[PDB]
Design an enzyme around this catalytic site. Structure first.
Site, PDB file in Angstrom:
ATOM      1  N   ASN A  11       0.810  -1.227   0.000  1.00 60.22           N
ATOM      2  CA  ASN A  11       0.000   0.000   0.000  1.00 60.22           C
ATOM      3  C   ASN A  11       0.852   1.289   0.000  1.00 60.22           C
ATOM      4  O   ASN A  11       0.329   2.359   0.313  1.00 60.22           O
ATOM      5  CB  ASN A  11      -1.055   0.059   1.129  1.00 60.22           C
ATOM      6  CG  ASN A  11      -1.254  -1.137   2.042  1.00 60.22           C
ATOM      7  OD1 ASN A  11      -1.026  -1.062   3.260  1.00 60.22           O
ATOM      8  ND2 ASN A  11      -1.744  -2.238   1.508  1.00 60.22           N
ATOM      9  N   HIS A  61       3.202   2.185   2.035  1.00 59.11           N
ATOM     10  CA  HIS A  61       3.486   2.684   3.381  1.00 59.11           C
ATOM     11  C   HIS A  61       4.829   2.136   3.856  1.00 59.11           C
ATOM     12  O   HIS A  61       5.148   0.987   3.550  1.00 59.11           O
ATOM     13  CB  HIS A  61       2.411   2.193   4.359  1.00 59.11           C
ATOM     14  CG  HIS A  61       1.139   2.969   4.334  1.00 59.11           C
ATOM     15  ND1 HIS A  61       0.488   3.308   5.501  1.00 59.11           N
ATOM     16  CD2 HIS A  61       0.420   3.421   3.283  1.00 59.11           C
ATOM     17  CE1 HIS A  61      -0.597   3.964   5.128  1.00 59.11           C
ATOM     18  NE2 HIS A  61      -0.679   4.058   3.801  1.00 59.11           N
ATOM     19  N   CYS A  72       6.034   7.505   9.279  1.00 59.98           N
ATOM     20  CA  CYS A  72       6.985   8.238   8.454  1.00 59.98           C
ATOM     21  C   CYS A  72       6.494   8.090   7.023  1.00 59.98           C
ATOM     22  O   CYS A  72       6.291   6.968   6.564  1.00 59.98           O
ATOM     23  CB  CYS A  72       8.391   7.666   8.625  1.00 59.98           C
ATOM     24  SG  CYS A  72       9.592   8.211   7.373  1.00 59.98           S
TER      25      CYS A  72
END
Ligand SMILES: Nc1ccccc1CO
Ligand SMILES: Nc1ccccc1CO
EC number: 3.1.2.14
Lengths: 263, 265
Positions: free
Chosen positions: B186, B188, B223
């Site tokens: 995804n 991330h 982050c």
């Protein structure tokens, strides 16, 4: 994983893991490059090695000089991929290692790779060129007749890569390797250079294209405390020229070409 | 890999790969943390998840990590087989907990163990919310009703409060950016990359003469792909203890905080 019936190649099946896939739910080229490295490591271990008895005495090692990888289909998370690898002599020049990636269910070829290896003194980093006695030690584990993953005369794996001229169209600067990027001998893994090369590829290209081919030449090793700059320029299906160099002095460590297809 | 007989836990065997080991010829803590993530993904998939439920997908709710505690007794060498058993547990309206037991496939001894706290959150607004009753009924059928703790102890180091590192930090690793290999499906940043970033500020001298026994790491903020991280470390102590802090290089926004424990070889 085990050697084939004749003992002139090794086969291993891998199941694609959740953390090994990209945004398109299929395994990344770095995951594929890791499985190629892993299957070659077990093939060397299954025949008692990839330093040999003679090599270890004179401080000799096998280094990568070129890696060419072509992918037709990327295995999805959950799929099983069978990789067959084998080494072959290339005279005094060096050793070549090939791979065939296949689907475990259908048995079709979903990818193939080839790599050129050269002899070097671990301490002085000098070429030396494959010598007598040491060549006969491993020749017994190689098919005597030519077995090429890329047999096609004058093909993508044997093309000359030019040096990227400035200014580069795209760039990713300030790339440093971490402890996970290092191997058991504290050297930067050969797969990290592939990930660094593709960092300069624009995100839009990645999202609307699939990586079909990657040829990457290894000129100099990046040390643990070194900083790399990644450069890219469109030379066209989309084709790109790549250059990895030290952030400071600009010493070339890698150069290559990638090929991408529309989804 | 497959679920156990009762279906209240899942087991999987992994063979340690060449690229998964460190300078000690044994698997790294990031490799172990990757196998824990992988065994949890297949346990969720074996009971029909994606780890979102029917009600969670409908309300745009996801499960996020709030804490990860890992204790290792022996690191499996390249070639060894390691069997990991995982299971989820309901912790009331606070959220869920997931535990792991790492064992030797040959001897059957416990070579490590882990525990993680998960919290309910809105995928879009990133706002934490308490677990509703209807969601709790959907995942409770896959959890042991009686308490099953990997760290049962009266005073275990998995439920300890971690303080914030004060400046100046003794050690630091500045300018850490995630790459495409550090991102998941995804896009991330993977939860394991934060562990690798935390240990980057640990001096090389410590790594070479010590083995990582314990690691507790709190997750405060994610982050982004285009963010830069600063890793900070300070010795707080045969055994060596450290305090850790991950923050954005610019503004200094805290994204992670934790503690590690090392022993002499
Ligand atoms: N040779 C090579 C180069 C790059 C990536 C992987 C491998 C396999 O060892
Ligand atoms: N929960 C968690 C935290 C850090 C690393 C790995 C995992 C497993 O998903």
């Amino acid at each position: 994983g085990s050697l084939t019936e004749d003992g002139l190649s090794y086969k291993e099946k891998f199941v694609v893991r959740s953390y090994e896939v990209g945004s398109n739910k299929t395994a990344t080229v770095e995951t594929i490059a890791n499985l190629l490295q892993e299957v070659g490591c077990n093939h060397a271990q299954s025949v008692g090695f990839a330093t040999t008895t003679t090599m270890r005495k004179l401080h000799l090692i096998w280094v990568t000089a070129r890696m060419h990888i072509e992918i037709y289909k990327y295995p999805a998370w959950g799929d099983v991929v069978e990789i067959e690898t084998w080494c072959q002599s290339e005279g005094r020049i060096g050793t070549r290692r090939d791979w065939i990636l296949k689907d475990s269910v259908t048995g079709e070829v979903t990818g193939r790779a080839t790599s050129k290896w050269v002899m070097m003194n671990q301490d002085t980093r000098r070429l030396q060129k494959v010598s007598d006695d040491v060549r006969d030690e491993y020749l017994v584990f190689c098919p005597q007749e030519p077995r090429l993953a890329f047999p096609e005369e004058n093909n993508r794996s044997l093309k000359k890569i030019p040096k990227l001229e400035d200014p580069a169209q795209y760039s990713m600067i300030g790339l440093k390797p971490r402890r996970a990027d290092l191997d058991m001998n504290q050297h930067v893994n050969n797969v990290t250079y592939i990930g660094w090369v593709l960092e300069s590829i624009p995100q839009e290209i990645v999202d609307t294209h699939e990586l079909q081919v990657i040829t990457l030449d290894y000129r100099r090793e990046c040390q643990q405390d070194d900083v790399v700059d990644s450069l890219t320029t469109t030379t066209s299906d989309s084709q790109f020229l790549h250059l990895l160099r030290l952030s400071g002095d600009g010493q070339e460590i890698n150069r290559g070409t990638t090929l991408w297809r529309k989804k």
